[PDB]
Write a protein that holds these residues in place. Structure first.
Motif, PDB file in Angstrom:
ATOM      1  N   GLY A 192     -63.152 111.237 -11.771  1.00 29.70           N
ATOM      2  CA  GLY A 192     -62.004 110.843 -10.948  1.00 29.70           C
ATOM      3  C   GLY A 192     -61.508 112.100 -10.319  1.00 29.70           C
ATOM      4  O   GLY A 192     -61.048 112.979 -11.023  1.00 29.70           O
ATOM      5  N   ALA A 193     -61.712 112.235  -9.003  1.00 29.48           N
ATOM      6  CA  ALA A 193     -61.352 113.447  -8.279  1.00 29.48           C
ATOM      7  C   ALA A 193     -60.244 113.309  -7.279  1.00 29.48           C
ATOM      8  O   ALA A 193     -59.720 114.326  -6.811  1.00 29.48           O
ATOM      9  CB  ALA A 193     -62.587 114.095  -7.671  1.00 29.48           C
TER      10      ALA A 193
ATOM     11  N   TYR B 103     -57.029 117.118  -7.293  1.00 34.86           N
ATOM     12  CA  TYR B 103     -58.369 117.105  -7.852  1.00 34.86           C
ATOM     13  C   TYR B 103     -58.523 116.017  -8.965  1.00 34.86           C
ATOM     14  O   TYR B 103     -59.367 116.160  -9.866  1.00 34.86           O
ATOM     15  CB  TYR B 103     -58.738 118.507  -8.337  1.00 34.86           C
ATOM     16  N   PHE B 104     -57.746 114.928  -8.884  1.00 38.32           N
ATOM     17  CA  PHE B 104     -57.910 113.772  -9.785  1.00 38.32           C
ATOM     18  C   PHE B 104     -57.349 112.528  -9.155  1.00 38.32           C
ATOM     19  O   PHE B 104     -56.569 112.623  -8.239  1.00 38.32           O
ATOM     20  CB  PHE B 104     -57.182 114.006 -11.151  1.00 38.32           C
TER      21      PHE B 104
ATOM     22  N   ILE C 163     -59.361 112.092 -13.410  1.00 33.61           N
ATOM     23  CA  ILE C 163     -59.176 112.901 -14.609  1.00 33.61           C
ATOM     24  C   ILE C 163     -58.953 114.372 -14.300  1.00 33.61           C
ATOM     25  O   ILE C 163     -59.430 114.879 -13.290  1.00 33.61           O
ATOM     26  CB  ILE C 163     -60.374 112.711 -15.550  1.00 33.61           C
TER      27      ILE C 163
HETATM   28  K   LIG Z   1     -61.390 115.672 -11.698  1.00 32.22           K
END
Ligand SMILES: [K+]
Ligand SMILES: [Br-]
Length: 731
Positions: free
Chosen positions: A266-267, A295-296, A317
């Motif tokens: 998950g970005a 970045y999640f 994440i």
């Molecule tokens: K990530």
């Protein structure tokens, strides 16, 4: 036959992924937890421990230990349902089920479904797929995967059928082109969430919101009690709705989106707020996907039911440096974060963490390099839940535990929340091997994901997993029979695999050298005097001998890669090996091996064990329904094996202290005797067997690692794949 046994877990606490925590909206202290391979649990407030609810799932239906969704009835807290099944590919041979209960999961009844449930597939952190109508509690919905759509029961989960007017089954899969047939499944209809104000007690709820894994059509709604569904107008696109929470106090649906299905990636993603009265959408992300600092994606969406202007969400994440939680006390207008950068790599924290009750959660490194801390806040935090009966209580699942706070509102006045593990009684490790030497600690575990432990006391969580080296998963472990302070283990590391040795029973371990090509730990055997190690690492093209106690390695021609290596427990010169229907023997302490049996033992058998105190006495257990099956024994150092006629099937075998006045160790098997599956003990060299488990204590796909206890009559260390390490004692 059948003997009265006492079964407990060896105390570890947690150790696995908990993708779902579910509070009953009506009853305080009624909490459940679903796992991906270890069944379901209910909280017992009086003992401050979780109670497992699915230990009756046995050998033939082992997949029902994967728990995809769980709903607990707000209109009748005695009722609870679970969607179970482990894989939607060929790894699980059976379809899933909806389990139903009227006593909080002490007893259940199953309605099998015509399709598979993916309790340990990708997408499993998304939920809850199960949802009960809060006004007419006979109605239950289940969002299904594999393209099957949305499913409904109108009679308390007794019969299920497809809601055919819900046509969008979803099209997202993590990777459509996976060769391994695991990432490439349609994750499907991912949550159902009701509007409680749309009906009255006894009457069908008219307004229903559905989350689908389709980036262009993520959210659907019925406004006529599920007769017809529409795509929800005005909605954002590009992402996957992990969580959808309705607040009827203010007339708002909050959704958290990510770019992947989770749980491991998950970005990118957003958090949105849909106002029901007006039909208006607002982006309320702490950090929007329009920023490239993000970045999640987002999950762990939870609303404070006692004060629904308060709500939280979390990173799905952030591996590095840790997870991030966010809190708003004003319906998402603004947010604060649970940590913040000061000057890199330093950070300020709105929490403290106390792991005194589960000290191994520092992973054997208290002081990793900044910005990292240890223990960490968490990872794979898909479930985060504020207690609907108490705004100061939150609990969230990680890949390894459940953390809980009792002073959540300390955050709001500028203080630090206190977080502690809350996993006593929840025992979720996969046991990969186990041994019980005749002096020192009672047992040493070799576990998946968190290493393994010397266990000084079975009631006490150990201090740390094995260190120097510290495997993520210890795959095999042995002790020298004649000198049990001398041990070896092997396992996995970031860099492939490794070996660890010791001569003071784990007091201090050091890491030895590898042979060429090691990708994983594989299996290992220690000679009886500690004077030779034979090691079948994974990935490596051979089995290898060390005469220098891990310093150097020599290939052994004759042995295939990955053969099962065991040592004779009396003669240091004798090693044994099993691979694809051939048994091999060495009588020169490992240097060379010869095939001795090439026929009449089944190709699928891969568990055998030599008996402490008895040179050349080997038992062997294995096979399949489609070939041959049972338990075999050699008394001639592997030259010949006899089938025991008393056993129809066996999958593993081991030994422990003989009965009083018997001449031979007790033999414990995982197996089938006289048409009954279970765990069995023989105190007469295999002439007869007694069942030592029962129908409420089957533990699914158990028995990969078992060991008797040479000091304790009647004791079996029983390994599971999802329910930790059990010990059974006779009563
Ligand atoms: K990530
Ligand atoms: Br990351």
């Amino acid at each position: 036959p059948s003997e009265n046994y006492t079964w407990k877990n060896v105390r570890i606490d947690g150790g696995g992924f908990v993708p779902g925590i579910i509070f009953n909206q009506k009853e305080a202290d009624l909490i459940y937890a679903r796992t991906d391979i270890g069944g379901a649990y209910r909280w017992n407030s009086a003992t401050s421990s979780w109670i497992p609810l699915l230990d009756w799932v046995g050998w033939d239906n082992w997949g029902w230990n994967g728990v995809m969704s769980l709903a607990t009835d707000a209109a009748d807290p005695n009722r609870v349902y679970a969607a179970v099944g482990m894989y939607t590919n060929t790894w699980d041979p059976n379809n899933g089920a909806i389990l139903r209960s009227t006593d909080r999961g002490n007893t259940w009844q199953a309605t099998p479904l015509p399709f598979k449930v993916g309790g340990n597939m990708p997408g499993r952190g998304m939920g809850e797929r199960l949802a009960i109508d809060p006004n007419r509690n006979s109605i239950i919905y289940y969002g299904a995967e594999g393209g099957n759509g949305l499913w409904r029961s109108t009679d308390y989960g007794a019969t299920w059928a497809k809601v055919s007017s819900f046509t969008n089954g979803g099209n997202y899969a993590q990777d459509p082109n996976d060769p391994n047939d695991y990432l490439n499944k349609i994750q499907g209809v991912v949550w159902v969430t009701f509007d409680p104000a749309s009906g009255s007690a006894g009457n069908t709820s008219q307004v229903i919101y559905v989350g689908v894994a389709d980036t262009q059509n993520a959210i659907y709604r019925s406004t006529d009690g599920g007769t017809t569904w529409s795509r929800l107008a005005g909605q954002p696109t590009g992402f996957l709705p992990h969580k959808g929470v309705y607040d009827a106090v203010n007339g708002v649906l909050y959704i958290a989106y990510s770019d992947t299905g989770g749980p491991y990636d998950g970005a990118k993603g957003d958090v949105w707020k849909f106002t029901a009265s007006s039909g208006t959408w607002t982006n309320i992300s702490p950090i929007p996907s329009s920023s490239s600092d993000l970045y999640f994606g987002y999950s762990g969406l939870t609303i404070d039911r006692k004060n629904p202007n308060t709500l939280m969400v979390a990173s799905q994440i952030a591996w590095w440096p840790d997870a991030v939680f966010f809190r708003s006390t004003n319906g998402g207008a603004s947010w604060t974060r649970i940590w913040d950068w000061t000057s890199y790599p330093s950070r300020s924290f709105r929490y403290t963490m106390d792991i005194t009750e589960v000290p191994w959660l520092n992973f054997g490194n208290s002081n990793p390099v900044a910005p990292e801390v240890s223990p960490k806040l968490g990872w794979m935090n898909e479930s985060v839940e504020i207690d609907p009966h108490n705004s100061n209580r939150l609990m969230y699942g990680t890949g390894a535990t459940i953390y809980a706070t009792e002073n959540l509102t300390s955050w709001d006045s500028g203080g630090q929340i206190l977080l502690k593990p809350m996993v006593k009684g929840l025992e979720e490790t996969a046991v990969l091997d186990v041994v019980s030497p005749p002096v020192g600690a009672p047992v040493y575990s070799a576990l998946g994901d968190i290493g393994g432990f010397r266990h000084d006391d079975l009631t006490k969580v150990p201090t740390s997993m094995y260190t120097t080296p510290n495997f993520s998963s210890t795959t095999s472990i042995d002790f020298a029979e004649l000198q049990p302070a001398t041990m070896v283990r092997v396992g996995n590391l970031d860099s492939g695999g490794g070996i660890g040795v010791t001569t003071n029973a784990g007091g201090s371990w050091w890491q030895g050298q590898n042979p060429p090509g090691v990708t994983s730990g594989g299996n290992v055997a220690l000679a009886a005097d500690g004077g030779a190690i034979v090691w079948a690492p994974g990935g490596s093209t051979n089995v290898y001998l060390s005469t220098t106690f891990g310093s150097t390695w020599t290939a052994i021609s004759a042995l295939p890669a990955g053969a099962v290596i065991e040592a004779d427990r009396v003669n240091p010169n004798k090693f044994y090996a099993l691979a694809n229907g051939t048994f091999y023997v060495s009588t020169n302490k490992g240097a060379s091996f010869s095939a001795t049996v090439t026929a009449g033992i089944p190709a699928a058998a891969r568990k055998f064990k030599a008996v402490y105190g008895r040179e050349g006495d080997i038992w062997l257990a294995g096979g399949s329904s489609t070939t041959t099956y049972g338990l075999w024994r050699s008394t001639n150092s592997g030259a010949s094996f006899t089938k025991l006629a008393s056993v129809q099937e066996a999958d593993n075998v081991t030994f422990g202290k003989a009965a009083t006045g018997a001449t031979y160790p007790a033999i414990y098997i995982i197996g089938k005797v006289d048409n009954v599956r279970g765990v069995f003990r023989s105190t007469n060299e295999g002439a007869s067997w007694v069942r030592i488990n029962d129908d409420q204590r089957q533990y699914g796909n158990f028995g990969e690692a078992i060991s008797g206890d040479p000091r304790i009559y009647g004791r079996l260390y029983l390994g599971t794949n999802g329910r930790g390490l059990l010990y059974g004692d006779s009563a």
